[PDB]
Amino acid sequence: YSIGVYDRITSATWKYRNMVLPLLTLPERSVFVISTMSSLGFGAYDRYRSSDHKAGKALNDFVEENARETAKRQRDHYDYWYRILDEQSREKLYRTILLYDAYKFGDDTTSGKATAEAKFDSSNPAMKNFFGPVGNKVVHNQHGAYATGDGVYYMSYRMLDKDGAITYTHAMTHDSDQDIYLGGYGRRNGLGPEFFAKGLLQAPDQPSDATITINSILKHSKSDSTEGSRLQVLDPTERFQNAADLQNYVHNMFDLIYMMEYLEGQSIVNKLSVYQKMAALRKIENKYVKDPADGNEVYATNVVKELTEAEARNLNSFESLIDHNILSAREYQSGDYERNGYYTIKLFAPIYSALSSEKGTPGDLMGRRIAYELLAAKGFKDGMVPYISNQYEEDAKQQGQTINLYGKERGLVTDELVLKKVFDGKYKTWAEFKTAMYQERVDQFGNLKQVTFKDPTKPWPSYGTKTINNVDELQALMDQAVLKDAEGPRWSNYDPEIDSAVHKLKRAIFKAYLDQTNDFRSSIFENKK
Amino acid sequence: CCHPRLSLHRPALEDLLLGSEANLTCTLTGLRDASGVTFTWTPSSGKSAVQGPPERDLCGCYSVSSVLPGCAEPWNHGKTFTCTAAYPESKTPLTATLSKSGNTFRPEVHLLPPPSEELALNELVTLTCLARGFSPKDVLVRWLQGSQELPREKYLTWASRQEPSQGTTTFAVTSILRVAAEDWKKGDTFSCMVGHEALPLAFTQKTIDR
Amino acid sequence: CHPRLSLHRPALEDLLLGSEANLTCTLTGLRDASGVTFTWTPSSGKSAVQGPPERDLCGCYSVSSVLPGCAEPWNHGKTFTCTAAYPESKTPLTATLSKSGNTFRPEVHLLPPPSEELALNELVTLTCLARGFSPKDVLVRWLQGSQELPREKYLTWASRQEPSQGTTTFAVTSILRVAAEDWKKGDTFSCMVGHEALPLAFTQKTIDR
């Protein structure tokens, strides 16, 4: 329980306990120790010395303040994760795992973060007096960060920079997702370690990122220019006080997302030609491939393909979009996806698809989407943990559905079992669940909607407001924007991104609604809407 | 540079009735190949469409466009355009509204003697006669005051911008003309007009100066 | 791909009326990795925020930024040779907004001509053609009381060339047909021309008759 360093390194079952004697003898302040709840980071001052920061008062000032800020950010992150978990597994968020820095020290002549890996004979005081005495030969490749399971190592992302915490949350999720973030049960048999991290359970890479994430670390006030295109949570420790607050936040966010997606879908089937509908949409399916780890081929990988013309003409019904498993091509590539890949779902790119594997594992692109939707229906306990944490594995084995894992008979948690257990009487097929969510959202925004929506959707000369008051004007704007993308659809650059007008309108509406209230609390304007 | 797509095409009916060469090539972009691509027209009066002459635009090689660049009897009907010289890779549909004569307008020349405080000599007079007469941008709009064609430098098909007027509004192209003092005393004023796409010429000549 | 320079020509009149000065410099010619790095070699301490890049429809993505934040230099404008680092080439590329004073006096042309020829019984026309160019921006601006309308929505014709031999002159024609009732209603009746050097925005008459 102690946050004190000596009570951590001194304590038994520590990977590098001997790190106390070099630390007590360090001649000068050449190493920093960020000892927060559940982490014991060790860094060198020479890691941040460059041309901009010179050895002396400047380096000591840049490191001390940035280390204090990083400690505060990690403390806020674990405060959030402690407030969320309420299944008495929070008492296990006291493990200690070191966060060694790169060992790539930089002289005052180096322009940026130098890439000279030290060889353990380096004259740099940190290597000679501490990091070298506590030997820990690390692979030290030039770029990337990896979590060995018992620790975390930063090779490129500096631990003190603001981009250090966005990698810190990813590495921690890989390091402790088997008995910490989940209810206590291990990862799902099909999902890999990269599934529970980049797409879900990670802070967003950038504030203006249009991705479905939870800003649990970075606390950025409205003073910064980042307020433009915030598209995320203002304060993590303020917004999230318990699991109910997270469920409500995700519920409101997905309410707005479902409203926008239903508007775009109504724009698709009504005002769009056939040839334009071909390129505007794609079809997602699940392909089963043999994996080297396990002999069984029950695992499914998501594959995105161009839908045929025969399927395009049959997409007239909005319900059909969900049934024919079609997804928008604005942000999702046309190539086949892979398992355990750095794939995240975009915030404004609709996925009307409810594709579910009747086999054990959904995939990656479809897995994260449904999991976030389940978080809207039910909170992190129940909801998301059954979908991604195989806690219903034993039930599967008792009913049937066995799988040969490493030569032993084990339970195979299928999506059908997850659906029949989480929502036993409410739904029977994932398509029904998606349709019921859309219908609830429709009955919602048909009556109660805030008229205070301020979306410019225009060029550099400042445009003050559009003041949409009822969903009909917003649907008309969405129709006009979709028509515009179909016209002149060069798609020249590999990523159109912000250029497409449809994305501009969605981002504007999202930012307007986020700035209207303090945060995502409720998206329903209780009048004759 | 970055896509698979085109740009807006300027339908070519200007060459068909206002020029000796009846070219029928509406401007198209993103086509970098030989002119063997099929041409599709909603309504065809008689003769098959003829693709326009190769030119390089936006670092794009030999770009195809769509001709019947001289079917004058069929052109008189005014049936739409919506040029679609689609490439095999590109979507087949083409669409620029240009069917039966729409929003036709008459020329409104505005030429009057102008005071020249800065030009006491009177050798050169800067007069910008008022224009109109063409609702359709893709037309061989030319000015021919008198029975003799005016200055090669001053004679061309200048582009025009639609101007904010009561009721119907028609684009006008400025026609400033520089002539010698003897020509001014000649009384050979130059008429200024704009011609609609549906009409073969659609040019009206009426001007009075000094 | 290949770098290109386009004269943005930011309205001078809008900048004077506007609380915040409006100025922009952009370079076109980027065909490389999605990540883009842009920096300005010369900084006068004025705001230089960069807006999202806008495609030219031939691919070749090109970045942009603002040069706002200048209110003290009403007539003493800064240099216009932007140089921002890009992913395709580390060396900066010169951007020119062609900043030249070109000081000159502007006189417009108003004529009551052929009443029968220009009247449809209820048709009225006003003649104010812009003459005299000093800066790189010219507008056919018209004064319409205190009414405010979006600049982007309005569409107007560009500059014209009206230069006497041995002299440099520019033309803009501050003309857009509107009701002539205001002229006889006692309301302000002066066409507005935007010139930083001499933006009188009213008819000028020579002493000679």
Residue numbers in the entry:
A (entry chain P): 1435 to 1963
B (entry chain B): 241 to 450
C (entry chain A): 242 to 450
Which of the paper's sentences describe this entry?
The overall structure reveals that S. pneumoniae IgA1P is a multi-domain enzyme, broadly comprised of N-terminal (NTD; residues 665–1070), middle (MD; 1071–1611), and C-terminal domains (CTD; 1612–1963). We have determined the structure of a member of the M26 metalloprotease IgA1P subfamily of bacterial IgA1Ps both in isolation as well as in complex with its human IgA1 substrate and solved its structure with a neutralizing mAb that provides insight into blocking S. pneumoniae IgA1P activity.
We engineered an active-site mutant in the context of IgA1P 665–1963 that removes one of the Zn-coordinating residues, referred to as IgA1P-E1605A. As EDTA was found to slow catalysis, the IgA1P-E1605A/IgA1 complex was purified for cryo-EM studies in the presence of EDTA. Regarding the complex structure, the IgA1P NTD binds to the substrate IgA1 Fab (of the HC) on one end while the IgA1P CTD engages both IgA1 Fc monomers at the other end. The ability of IgA1P to broadly cleave polyclonal IgA1 is also explained by this structure, as IgA1P does not interact with the variable region of the IgA1 substrate. Although there is no visible density from residues 233–240, which connects the remaining hinge within the IgA1 HC, it is clear that IgA1 residues P227 and T228 are properly aligned for cleavage within the IgA1P cleavage site consistent with previous biochemical studies. Potentially the most striking finding of the S. pneumoniae IgA1P/IgA1 complex is the conformational change associated with substrate binding, which underlies an active-site gating mechanism.
